[PDB]
């Protein structure tokens, strides 16, 4: 009775995307129901304090499609349970793959993690955000994603991360103040080794205990939503974690594995429901706004059609049940049409990480400003590849770790020059077509690499240069969210003005939607330039709306203060030109009055 | 007044100071600040008062500052500090004062005093000015508070006018301007007697929201205040009169540095009883924001 | 089915304000129904003569919300009964919190107090009074309260008090001749220690046995009402008595207690709905079953704090909200010794919802001023005059309670300075000013003679002093003041509009002149606080023409020297005290003159 016929036959068929509704521990006030998928298991038993851990007190009965299910009177929420599965001669104790919450019995996860019976009752208040949230339509809207690892963000006391509920107000305040639209959280699903950052996952249906209850995660997502903030969750369907007690050789054979050793067998229908139910599980039960699949490349190549067809059906299923969700992919092999609809033969994502832009932008800016003349093309040629896909410009945790160095460390020269370069890099990324992702700590230009066992170097927010960079990004986001010329990342919305100044390493382009136009002039050299002429389409009065070199950001204060007037003689093939003074290592944004 | 206790010399001098002033210059104004709860500072000498026209409401200042200095998560537990301010607002003719003495000696700027990051700090400062203009009594703001300058007032230097270039502070200055324009034009705010104030609701302590009315004759102004960064939707507020109501001011308007969240006007009172009132308004409360609403004529 | 399902649903809500209808012991001719609230009980049983005090004879059945009920055939009125509650390993015998009458089995309250099954059937004859009671409308009518402890008032013989009935005609006789408007009774609810004065309460629903049966008390109130006198009952929701069989640890754990420095662990847990039912139902119980006109809550500050206690503040607000809903013309008075605002203000304006507040600020200032010698009063003039800055902050009752005449504080008489004449003069002056000052009047028994000794509850008041002149004069003065109060509406309106200053700056001569007004009527009060007669003392007045002397404290009939204007005072149109016309008067020693324009 626990299972309908439509459940079993949906399971068989690879289509049970509600499987979480039936699989795992489902609490009832008298007792908890248990359901496990173990097709090659001869026996399955649920164990717990609720029956003195007796392998024979409660042994789930076998139903079809390799599913087992049984009801245990006296198993209550918070009771730790375990699966004792027998395969021929050998028995093994295993986690619940569908466990909704897990906890380390010894207080140390590397040693433990046990499945915990849990009720997921929660009363939401985010209705307004969810009938307004915009998924695919977000292509024509500002998307500023702040990348966050919760444990490393801030600590209530040294070595202690903020609770889910505890971090709710500080994170929203910060995100709001700096004007980011969403947060992207490194995977919160349960993982034994904190040092993995969450990418080696044991419990795909359980939020990591370290920050609190499953309901705690709902409060945070609920809280951020009411403050008008979006939450993107990192998702790791490419591989499961190397845990003996978990998904490895589960029923006794290869099951989640392929019939190295920990990539999911997409050929199996059971694996397909497990993952694709997990995609909807987060979008549904935790109101997640976006999923982000990393290392799609490893899923793509061995071509793995089983995996490519899974990735297409993954995206299709998501948008069918959640039309205003977002799916983002990181792909490194330049596979065509990641952000393209499946009906055009695409993977079906809404977005793709433009890591092509990231390398070019990073490589160009570690060069000393002197040498930048000789790599002008590396900078200017980013726009030949900027429209192949819906792109998010990305600065990530991977970029700031393993000797890659902090973005401030990457920037060349003296600390004022490094701060100016960082501001110019941020200014170009907002100007450059595509959505913006910035990882925690880059916003104030932190000094070391990301260290996950510590809290960000917030004390650096007393130094003038870093406080200024944080001020530059806030204003960058402020113009971004306001002026729709930056909302449209198509080839339309960008217009070159001048790319030929290699010697002085200067770039001028135009960002436009309909009537609105934005002029970006960028000087990648510490030498200032005055009497610099920049072609413009429109004449008349021109205002300077942002300047890297303003003192509030920590710059020397060289600018074009007085409203810039346009001189009507042709320049850069344009009717009018603006005589301009270019501040050292700075980007100027100009709006016609 | 005291030597530590009463100095009658000083009290009689104070009284005849005030009497001669108003006798020779009937249209002058005399104001006193007194750090005790001495009665009748603003009262006429012939009624045994000291004879001042106005008294600084330092009770209000301390109370208000004490409350908003605290974090929104905690404002729940200090709701009574906010609401009980009006039990003392009609004891004297009062000028709600935030002064140079408040922004000195390690007390911190008004901006510095407010909690959260800069967006929320600016939001709170807009709220403080929002409530002070709503609270009964005349208004005093010390120089530089109108844009929310960071540093304590230093007499050896000039104010941080450069912050008027940054948006958060230029927004606050605009908010004060709009507040003063509302004050100058609406007579509902001119009468600081108990007749000039009516409570709409004060017991939403959990969500830290207060609604009150500033009314002179027929004219009435509705003040709805959300002291939390979460906006509130479908929040109902009782009204005395039913009909179209307009939103005259929104602290959360983008012009002041805000979310841009708001009712958007054309609010029609719903002929449903709420807060013991015949009609009610269904409003959306922006983050850390003040709404001022007028019926439509 | 003893309990309605609505009753259990209302009990869990904390909305059962008639809960006395079902909880406690309710007699039936065959047997008594028993109902007690004990949520943390494994079992509850009724013990009594009706079952050889056997705990297994009659075990109540547990209903919803920790409400236990059972029927006992043969349990009869006047029988003593007891509850046995079992908390796991331990069981204990407890008294009924909802007991309607208690009596000491030994004969001594301090040893044993026992719940007794009672019928409250009583036929009232007070129909006329309650169709006309005021209260909220009494804000503009004279309220003159005679505060009384029944046991201490009068004795039939030394150490033997009057029954509830026996007291009726003497107290009603005395209160009417005095002109007092109400009697405020020190707490009548059952209390073990007589020396507590009743503030350590065990039987909130039971009138004390010392003065008779519950009906005896209803008759007393019924009687007084027919005589046109109101009854205020002191009530103690702040704390309960420390009696082991009492409310303490009722079900074997914390129940009425919190799960205050004054009475720690004896403070009611206003958080629990069950506590809220018990307290508010009891408030209504007295207004309902005993027709009480008003209830006075003491030490309200002890509830407000521990910093504010919001449990209690919502409780007080709901108490006042509930009372006026079920009894629109009741009166609730509060004594709060902090400067907590809006005690007398309606809950809808963030007030506590009381109708009246004791002006304890006034009492302190006033007593401190008159404790001082007239020679020295010069230097403390502001203590006298400044009472009017705080005199309209609330709807106030001027108070001279028992708390001021105990513990070495001295009788009001003892407090006044000088020889006997000046002591009598000072007290006649004090009351005159108190009757003139804005606010209703409360005087504790024995103050009307200005008795020498502190209030000693173990004895009867010194009525023998009523034979001697000085004390008989003060009794006459209070009666006559009470006549002036009721006759003239100028004193009924304690609003700022009612009072106007005539002069307050005569510090040297220690004199005060003020006006008390309603519309047409004016009453002029001139006070000489020094034993020196003042002659040619001019006092400004609004109206010209003939003025009358309505009262003079110094009349020889009151024990005074007799210097007086004796009426026939004509206003002179010369500006005095910033006023168009002036009166040229004689100010008697340590006396009050009360004058009105002739009509």
TrEMBL record, chain B:
The active site is at 33 (proton donor). Monomer. Belongs to the glycosyl hydrolase 13 family. GlgB subfamily. Catalyzes the formation of the alpha-1,6-glucosidic linkages in glycogen by scission of a 1,4-alpha-linked oligosaccharide from growing alpha-1,4-glucan chains and the subsequent attachment of the oligosaccharide to the alpha-1,6 position. This is 1,4-alpha-glucan branching enzyme GlgB. The chain holds residues 311 to 620 of 620 of the full protein.
């Amino acid at each position: 009775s626990w299972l309908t016929e439509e459940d079993i036959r949906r399971w068989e068929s690879g289509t049970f995307y509600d499987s979480y509704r039936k699989l795992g521990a489902h609490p009832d006030e008298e007792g908890t129901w248990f359901c496990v998928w173990a097709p090659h298991a001869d026996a399955v038993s649920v164990l717990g304090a609720f029956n003195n851990w007796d392998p024979e007190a409660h042994q789930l009965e076998r139903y079809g499609a390799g599913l087992w299910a049984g009801y245990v009177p006296g198993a209550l929420p918070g009771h730790a349970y375990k699966y004792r599965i027998r395969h021929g001669f050998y028995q093994a104790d295993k986690t619940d793959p569908y466990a909704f919450a897990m906890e380390p019995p010894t207080g140390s996860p590397i040693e433990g993690l046990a499945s915990i019976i849990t009720r997921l009752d929660y009363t939401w208040h985010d209705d307004a955000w969810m009938q307004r949230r915009k998924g695919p339509a977000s292509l024509y809207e500002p998307v500023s994603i702040y990348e966050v690892h919760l444990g490393s963000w801030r600590h209530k006391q040294p070595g202690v991360s903020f609770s889910y509920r505890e971090i709710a107000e500080p994170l929203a305040d910060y995100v709001q103040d700096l004007g980011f639209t969403h947060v992207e959280l490194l995977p919160i699903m349960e993982h034994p080794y904190y040092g993995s950052w969450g990418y080696q996952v044991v419990g795909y249906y359980a939020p990591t205990f370290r920050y609190g209850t499953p309901q705690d995660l709902m409060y945070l997502i609920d809280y951020l939503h009411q403050r008008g903030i979006g939450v993107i969750l990192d998702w790791v369907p490419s591989h499961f974690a190397a845990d003996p007690q978990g998904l490895v050789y589960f029923d006794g054979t290869t099951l989640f594995e392929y019939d190295g050793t920990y990539v999911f067998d997409y050929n199996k229908p059971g694996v397909r429901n497990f993952l694709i139910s997990n995609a909807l599980f987060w979008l549904d039960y935790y109101h997640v706004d976006g999923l982000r699949v990393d290392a799609v490349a490893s899923m793509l190549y061995r071509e793995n059609l089983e995996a490519i067809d899974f990735i297409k059906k993954f995206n299709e299923t998501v948008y069918l049940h959640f039309p205003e969700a977002i799916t983002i992919a990181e792909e490194s092999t330049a596979w065509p049409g990641v952000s393209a609809p499946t009906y055009n033969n695409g993977l079906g994502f809404l977005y793709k990480w433009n890591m092509g832009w990231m390398h070019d932008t990073l490589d160009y800016m570690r060069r000393d400003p002197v040498h930048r003349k000789y790599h002008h093309d590396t900078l200017t040629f980013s726009l030949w590849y900027a429209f192949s896909e819906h792109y998010i410009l990305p600065l990530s945790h991977d970029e700031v770790v393993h000797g890659k160095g902090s973005l401030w460390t990457k920037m060349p020269g003296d600390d004022w020059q490094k701060a100016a370069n960082l501001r110019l890099l941020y200014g170009h990324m907002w100007g450059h077509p595509g959505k913006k992702l910035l990882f925690m700590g880059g916003e104030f230009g932190q000094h070391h690499e990301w260290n996950h066992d510590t809290q960000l170097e917030w004390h650096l927010l007393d130094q003038p240069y870093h406080r200024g960079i944080q001020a530059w990004v806030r204003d960058l986001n402020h113009l971004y969210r306001t002026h729709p010329a930056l909302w449209h990342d198509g080839p339309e919305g960008f217009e070159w003005i001048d790319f030929n100044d290699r010697d002085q390493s200067v770039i001028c382009y135009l960002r436009k939607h309909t009537d609105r136009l934005l002029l970006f002039v960028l000087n990648f050299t510490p030498v200032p330039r005055e009497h610099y002429r920049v072609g413009v389409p429109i004449g008349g009065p021109w205002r300077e709306v942002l300047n890297s070199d303003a003192v509030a950001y920590g710059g020397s204060g060289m600018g074009n203060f007085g409203r810039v007037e346009a001189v009507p003689e042709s320049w850069h093939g344009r009717p009018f030109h603006l005589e301009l003074t270019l501040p050292p290592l700075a980007i100027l944004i100009l709006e016609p009055e | 007044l005291y030597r530590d206790r009463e100095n009658l010399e000083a009290i009689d001098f104070i009284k005849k100071f005030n009497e001669t002033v108003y006798l020779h210059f009937p249209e002058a104004i005399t104001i006193a600040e007194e750090s005790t709860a001495w009665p009748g500072v603003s009262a006429p000498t012939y009624n045994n008062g000291l004879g001042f026209l106005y008294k600084w409401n330092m009770g209000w200042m301390h109370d208000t500052l004490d409350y908003m200095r605290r974090d929104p998560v905690h404002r729940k537990y200090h709701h009574d500090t906010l609401t009980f301010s009006l039990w003392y607002a009609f004891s004297e003719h009062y000028i709600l004062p935030l002064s140079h003495d408040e922004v000195v000696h390690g007390k911190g700027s008004l901006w510095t005093k407010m909690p959260g990051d800069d967006w929320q700090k600016a939001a709170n400062l807009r709220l403080l000015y929002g409530h002070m203009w709503g609270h009964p009594g005349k208004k005093l703001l010390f120089m530089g508070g109108e844009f929310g300058q960071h540093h304590e007032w230093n007499h050896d230097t000039q104010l941080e006018w450069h912050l008027l270039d940054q948006p958060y502070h230029r927004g606050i200055q605009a908010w004060v301007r709009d507040l003063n324009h509302l004050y100058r034009t609406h007579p509902a705010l001119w009468h600081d007697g108990p007749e000039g104030f009516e409570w709409i609701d004060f017991n939403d302590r959990d969500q830290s929201v207060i609604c009150y009315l500033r009314k002179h004759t027929d004219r009435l102004l509705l003040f709805v205040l959300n002291f939390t960064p979460v906006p509130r939707e479908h929040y109902r507020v009782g009204v005395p009169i039913g009909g179209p109501w307009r939103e005259v001011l929104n602290s959360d308007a983008v012009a002041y540095g805000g979310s841009g969240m708001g009712n958007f006007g054309r609010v029609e009172a719903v002929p449903e009883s709420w807060h013991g009132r015949p009609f009610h308004l269904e409003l959306t409360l922006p983050p850390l924001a003040i709404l001022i609403l007028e019926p439509e004529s």
